[PDB]
Structure 1
Amino acid sequence: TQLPAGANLALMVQKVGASAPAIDYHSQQMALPASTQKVITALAALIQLGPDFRFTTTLETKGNVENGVLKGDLVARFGADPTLKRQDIRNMVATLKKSGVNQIDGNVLIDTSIFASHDKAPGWPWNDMTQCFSAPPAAAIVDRNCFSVSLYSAPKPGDMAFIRVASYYPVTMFSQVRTLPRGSAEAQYCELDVVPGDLNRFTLTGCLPQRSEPLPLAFAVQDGASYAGAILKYELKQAGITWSGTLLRQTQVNEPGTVVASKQSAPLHDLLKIMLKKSDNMIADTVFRMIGHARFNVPGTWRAGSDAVRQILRQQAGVDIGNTIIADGSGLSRHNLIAPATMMQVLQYIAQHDNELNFISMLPLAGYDGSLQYRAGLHQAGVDGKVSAKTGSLQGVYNLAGFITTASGQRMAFVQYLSGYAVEIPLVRFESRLYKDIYQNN
């Protein structure tokens, strides 16, 4: 340990297929897994949904089309596809038009019944909810439910800073930001804040020091259904389709209408690969609630996802996670809690079934891709191209979970759970020593 005063390490290193570990340091102690949770999410997803699962979104008609008039409702059934884009909506609407519908004598329903309850997992800090990495992974996603904004200081200090936003983003921005004389010391404790409101309103408050250039800001959409509905409304109007009713949310499970247009995501194995390479929280969390929906045939919720993942691990993978707490798929939640010894059983299962799962090729390869392209510790250990592992990074948490091929060619699984990390290169020195050790001595 080259580690800062008071950091907490739980570490286990074990040959693939071996029954005893080579390194065992507090391996039974529960810890915050952060994004290494995604290893569990990917395995349960492959087992439950399979590599060829695709998310799907449809436009459905309920009623007869007479003389180009739908006598009934248009239903836009969202399916938690994390990769759905504005263009996909525009294309599905183009297809609707081409099918013969010019007018809807009825309502436009934004159907999110695939999921229920909150779009935010237990244990997610409230303060990060407006940041894109923590965007609520709702059933209705368009362009990752993230949008950007430019904040301009006013030429006269004391005047309102002003917001520029692209006109297509259906959000409502208000500025209550005071522009400060670019020296004086309201600047020290006057915060610049974002305050979300209902229906995708955002108010910027506080102070902004004079700047020559505008401040770029990216925010998370809080109400995906409303956002997706406004985009749909816009695309309908552009395509010349009129309607007499209003846009309504449909949350209760219901029989599908006639599918007039659809979009399916890339295959799940492809999505899980992005997820593990890049640590994509939104893919992990839409997958997570999908798992529960598919296993129990109920609208997907965080609790059903948690129950399902535990059941899948125990029953299909032979891993009893015991008192482990699984709160989400991404590892964002501070309620996730698992011991290296438990994550080790998952890793051993994966290595044993890797020819079936094609799992290890999806993990970041040190020195090549994803989160490990340049991890100084690993590069300096001389283990580039020898480590395939998932990172887990949160405020003062630096985890790694995966596989290393050692100097003798032995594959070893490892779990490094390092937290309570706080500062007044210790990591880099720690990692370069440890992985050089593991590689060289095994």
Structure 2
Amino acid sequence: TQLPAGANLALMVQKVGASAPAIDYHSQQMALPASTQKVITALAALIQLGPDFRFTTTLETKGNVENGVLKGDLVARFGADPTLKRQDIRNMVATLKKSGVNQIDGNVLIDTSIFASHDKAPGWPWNDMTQCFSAPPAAAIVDRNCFSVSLYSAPKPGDMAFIRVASYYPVTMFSQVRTLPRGSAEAQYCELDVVPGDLNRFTLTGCLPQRSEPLPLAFAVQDGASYAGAILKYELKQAGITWSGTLLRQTQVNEPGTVVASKQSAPLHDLLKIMLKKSDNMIADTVFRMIGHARFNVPGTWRAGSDAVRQILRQQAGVDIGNTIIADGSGLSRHNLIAPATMMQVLQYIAQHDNELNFISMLPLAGYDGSLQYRAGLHQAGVDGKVSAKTGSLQGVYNLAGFITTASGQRMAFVQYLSGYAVEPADQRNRRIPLVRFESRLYKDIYQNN
């Protein structure tokens, strides 16, 4: 129990298939799940979409092709594939050319109709939206909608710091950054900021102290449709395909044209494995809106995703999540709220159906992979290779949800929702001892005593 001052612990530990818990500490109390939400996303995804689902992107033609000229529109139909790469667009364009299209007497349509409404879930902090871990998981993703930039201080203080960016990234960078002399009075409270604008404009503002080396930065693309469009436009031009119209967005549901090129992701089981092992927000959130699209046959939205996951858990898994709030697939949202006792029902379902789902093998294994390769507390408890669990991690939050095989060989499911492991400013970069000692004793206890 003895953690630092002010932290909030809800904890439940329960033998697989048992009706009573071994440990029950505030298990009914709802908490922020953070990335442990991905356990629920993966279960709902496997039930709704199946392990063999693949994300799809196509180039389609609407119109007849006469002497190499398409009389009509080229449609690039995006499908929320989180693994789509620039190369993939290049290869699809190569295929289009090879099929005999040299020219489009028409428009080039960037079709995102698979999804609708905002590409950002309710409850996501605005300030993180330009960080790649929170890049809007839109229908149109290329290279994870994340790009990098180099910021160089100016040789002469007072002059503008300047930005280098690879020419192939269709973004527009502006610097309003003032370079500060060493010892400037401004260093303390002058911030270095990124301000996103329309059409993938970014302005860097504020101050940068002199440095000998450039500062590397990575940012999230805010308008994936425009970004993918510019990549497509560039690849069309390089392949020698001309067009008379313009690049337009297509957002309304429409009958497919003739598929001339396509790309499918790896199978969903493989993607869910990456997601659980590495805690991939983008895979979780593209999956989440896909679940709603599939279940209700409507463009995927956050609301449809939430409704669908609740229905799938109740109807296929027998889990009534009650007053649980599910806002997204990744757990980014500060709106997500769930009790250890509700997550426990999910974990029990997974364990009972694990031979069907092949689910537990996707979770990080303590001491081997993903997020638990070295978790000090688990290592020190002597439980490496005995815990398969999903982390939920952000400032002051140390959640864990999954399974442990005990000294007697009994498998137990557990949920540790721990937050407010906040520290005073003067110790903010050190916060470890109590957690590690707590986890070491706890999982040692659970392991040895069960």
TM-score range, shorter chain: over 0.9
Q: Secondary structure at the match of 1:229?
A: helix
The 8 Å contact of residues 305 and 328 in structure 1, kept in 2 or not, is answered as yes
Q: CA deviation at 1:185?
A: 2.1
Q: Distance in 2 between matches of 1:185 and 1:345?
A: 56
- Per-residue Cα deviation, 1:165-186 (whole angstroms, up to 9, x for no partner): 0000000000000000021220
Q: CA deviation at 1:267?
A: 0.1
Q: Distance in 2 between matches of 1:121 and 1:151?
A: 30
Q: Distance in 2 between matches of 1:197 and 1:352?
A: 49
Q: Distance in 1 between matches of 2:4 and 2:184?
A: 36
Q: CA deviation at 1:433?
A: 0.7
The 8 Å contact of residues 2 and 429 in structure 1, kept in 2 or not, is answered as no
- The residue that corresponds to 1:130 in the other structure is 130
Q: Distance in 2 between matches of 1:226 and 1:398?
A: 37
Q: Distance in 1 between matches of 2:111 and 2:377?
A: 47
- Per-residue Cα deviation, 1:145-184 (whole angstroms, up to 9, x for no partner): 0000000000000000000000000000000000000212
Q: Secondary structure at the match of 1:311?
A: helix
| Pick aligned residue for 2:440 from 414, 432, 435 | 432
- Per-residue Cα deviation, 1:220-240 (whole angstroms, up to 9, x for no partner): 000000000000000000000
Q: Distance in 2 between matches of 1:213 and 1:437?
A: 49
Q: CA deviation at 1:421?
A: 1.5
- Per-residue Cα deviation, 1:261-311 (whole angstroms, up to 9, x for no partner): 000000000000000000000000000000000000000000000000000
Q: Distance in 1 between matches of 2:206 and 2:434?
A: 36
- The residue that corresponds to 1:65 in the other structure is 65
Q: Distance in 2 between matches of 1:253 and 1:395?
A: 41
Q: Distance in 2 between matches of 1:166 and 1:184?
A: 32
Q: Distance in 2 between matches of 1:39 and 1:140?
A: 25
Q: Provide the alpha-carbon RMSD of the alignment.
A: 0.4
Q: CA deviation at 1:432?
A: 0.4
The 8 Å contact of residues 2 and 427 in structure 1, kept in 2 or not, is answered as no
Q: Distance in 2 between matches of 1:287 and 1:389?
A: 20
- Per-residue Cα deviation, 1:244-270 (whole angstroms, up to 9, x for no partner): 000000000000000000000000000
Q: Secondary structure at the match of 2:154?
A: coil
Q: CA deviation at 1:341?
A: 0.1
- Per-residue Cα deviation, 1:16-54 (whole angstroms, up to 9, x for no partner): 000000000000000000000000000000000000000
Q: Distance in 1 between matches of 2:194 and 2:241?
A: 36
Q: CA deviation at 1:78?
A: 0.1
- The residue that corresponds to 2:429 in the other structure is none
Which range is displaced more, 422-431 or 171-180? 422-431
- Per-residue Cα deviation, 1:108-142 (whole angstroms, up to 9, x for no partner): 00000000000000000000000000000000000
Q: Secondary structure at the match of 1:202?
A: strand
Residue 4 in structure 1 maps to residue 4 in structure 2: yes
What is the TM-score when the length of structure 2 is the normalising length? 0.98
Q: Distance in 2 between matches of 1:381 and 1:158?
A: 54
Q: Distance in 2 between matches of 1:430 and 1:261?
A: 54
Residue 169 in structure 1 maps to residue 177 in structure 2: no
The 8 Å contact of residues 396 and 420 in structure 1, kept in 2 or not, is answered as yes
Q: Distance in 2 between matches of 1:196 and 1:315?
A: 42
Q: CA deviation at 1:396?
A: 1.2
Q: Secondary structure at the match of 1:186?
A: helix
Which range is displaced more, 175-184 or 304-313? 175-184
Q: After TM superposition, which residue ranges in structure 1, 4 or more long, deviate above 3 angstroms?
A: none
Q: CA deviation at 1:2?
A: 3.9
Q: Distance in 1 between matches of 2:38 and 2:184?
A: 46
- Per-residue Cα deviation, 1:328-367 (whole angstroms, up to 9, x for no partner): 0000000000000000000000000000000000000000
Q: Distance in 2 between matches of 1:281 and 1:185?
A: 39
- The residue that corresponds to 2:342 in the other structure is 342
Q: Distance in 2 between matches of 1:405 and 1:67?
A: 67
The 8 Å contact of residues 400 and 415 in structure 1, kept in 2 or not, is answered as yes
- Per-residue Cα deviation, 1:94-114 (whole angstroms, up to 9, x for no partner): 000000000000000000000
Q: Number of matched residues?
A: 442
Which range is displaced more, 179-188 or 370-379? 179-188
Q: Secondary structure at the match of 1:228?
A: helix
- Per-residue Cα deviation, 1:187-226 (whole angstroms, up to 9, x for no partner): 0000000000000000000000000000000000000000
| Unaligned 5+ runs, structure 1 | none
Q: Distance in 1 between matches of 2:147 and 2:63?
A: 35
- Per-residue Cα deviation, 1:394-419 (whole angstroms, up to 9, x for no partner): 22111000000000000000000001
- The residue that corresponds to 1:102 in the other structure is 102
- Per-residue Cα deviation, 1:50-71 (whole angstroms, up to 9, x for no partner): 0000000000000000000000
| Unaligned 5+ runs, structure 2 | 425-432
Q: Distance in 2 between matches of 1:185 and 1:3?
A: 39
Q: Distance in 2 between matches of 1:25 and 1:141?
A: 42
Matches within 5 A, 1:165-244: 165-244=165-244
